[PDB]
Structures are given as C-alpha cells and as structure tokens.
C-alpha cells in the first residue's frame, strides 16, 4: 500500500530537518543565546568590531547597557 512509502519519506524528512535545526541552535549557543549577527555591509562590521572592544572580553556578542555608564 502507498502508505508503506511514508517511513522512507519520514526518515528523509528528519535528515533534512537536522541541518536547519543544528545551525540555528549552534548560532544561539555560540552567540550568547542570540542570533548570530549579520554584517553584509561595512557599517554593520564596524559596529560589530566596536562591540568587540566595548565588551571588555573581546566578544562582539557580549553587550553592555546602561550599567556601563557612570
């Protein structure tokens, strides 16, 4: 019966799900729980490099708020 084809489709589907799920979770893990920053243009890279210096730990994704003003 045609539904005997589904188990192969399901296994193929789970395999194709993993790359999309893995990349999303890894990006959160590597960027302190946020989306990885996108820097398509030089301005966005400039702001990233500033955040790397401003952080104090050389990590562009560690962000400082009003607690860093005196």
């Amino acid at each position: 019966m045609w539904f005997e084809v589904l188990p192969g489709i399901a296994v193929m589907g789970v395999c194709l799900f993993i790359p999309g799920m893995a990349t999303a979770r890894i990006h959160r893990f590597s960027n302190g729980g946020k989306e990885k920053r996108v820097a398509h243009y030089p301005y966005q890279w400039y702001l990233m490099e500033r955040d790397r210096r401003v952080s104090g730990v050389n990590r562009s994704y560690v962000s400082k708020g009003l607690e860093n003003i005196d």
Partner: protein, 174 residues
C-alpha cells in the same frame, strides 16, 4: 600566513597560467585556465569586489565549457599531450615553475624583490584602506552606475554584441 592569502592565491594564479601557456592538449589547457579563473576570483574578492570576482569566474566557466566541446571536435588527436608527454611542453612548464619559484623565494626571504622592477614583499594588506563604515558596497554602486552614468557604454557594448551575432553567422557560412 593568512595575511598572505592574496599572495598565495596569486602564486596559484601564475601556476595555472604556466599550465596552459605551455600549451598541452586544450583539454588540460582549459583546466589550467579554470584554476586561474578560480583563484583570480579569490584575489579580486579579497579586495572587496565579490561581484567582479564571481562574474569573471562564471563567465570563464561558460567559455571553457564551449572550448571543451570545440576541442573534442576540432583540436583533438590520438594521444593528447599532458605536460609530461612532450619535451617542449615539459620544458616550458618547468621553466615557468622555476621562474615563479625563485621570484617567490626571494620576495619572501627579503620581504622585497626586483624582478626587472621593484616590488615590495611586506604583504598586500599594508595598502588597504582604513576607514570603511558606509552602509553599502562600493563595487555594487559603481557597477550599478552603468545604467545611469554609462549610457554611452551601454550603447556601444550592446551594439557590438548584436554585431557579434551577425558576424559569426557570416564567418561560419560556406
């Protein structure tokens, strides 16, 4: 060694050129021109021109595909020559590799070299601009200007491609 990426790619660029300039079978000549078009893409891309580098790579991939088809039809023989099959091919290939090797060796050792002319071997990074923080790509805006500033260029190139179609049909008709 990563600060010398552009130089390393340019070494492979020359090796590809020596590959097809020694003129083995055009099958292998095409391959060397593909390798040179690949690293050439990387060299241009590393100066901020991703579009230009990708275009030349794409255009030469199409051109070499047609050359391959023409080779099997019009430039083949029983025993196509690799670089080792012919003394003239091998001799030209060896000479180019040795000339390139001694240029690379001396420029690296001294951080400078004179190959007829003076070249600085400090690495290509030193000449880069230090103040980029615009929210666009300068290569894109320059290329995009072909349709606003480059009216006259569009006309002559557009005409030449039309004439190219006309002309190749005249030439190849008996």
């Amino acid at each position: 060694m990563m600060l010398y990426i552009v130089f390393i790619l340019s070494v492979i660029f020359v090796m590809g050129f020596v590959g097809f300039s020694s003129k083995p079978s055009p099958i292998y000549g095409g391959l060397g021109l593909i390798v040179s078009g690949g690293v050439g893409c990387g060299i241009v891309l590393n100066f901020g021109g991703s579009f230009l580098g990708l275009m030349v790579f794409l255009i030469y991939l199409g051109g070499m595909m047609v050359v391959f088809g023409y080779t099997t039809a019009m430039a083949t023989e029983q025993y196509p020559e690799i670089w080792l099959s012919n003394k003239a091919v091998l001799g030209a290939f060896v000479t180019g590799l040795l000339m390139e090797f001694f240029m690379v060796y001396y420029v690296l050792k001294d951080k400078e070299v004179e190959v007829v002319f003076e070249f600085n071997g400090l690495g290509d990074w030193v000449i880069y601009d230090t103040g980029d923080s615009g929210f666009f790509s300068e290569e894109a805006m320059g290329i995009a200007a072909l349709y606003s500033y480059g009216t006259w260029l569009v006309i002559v190139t557009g005409w030449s491609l039309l004439i190219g179609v006309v002309v190749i049909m005249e030439i190849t008709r008996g």
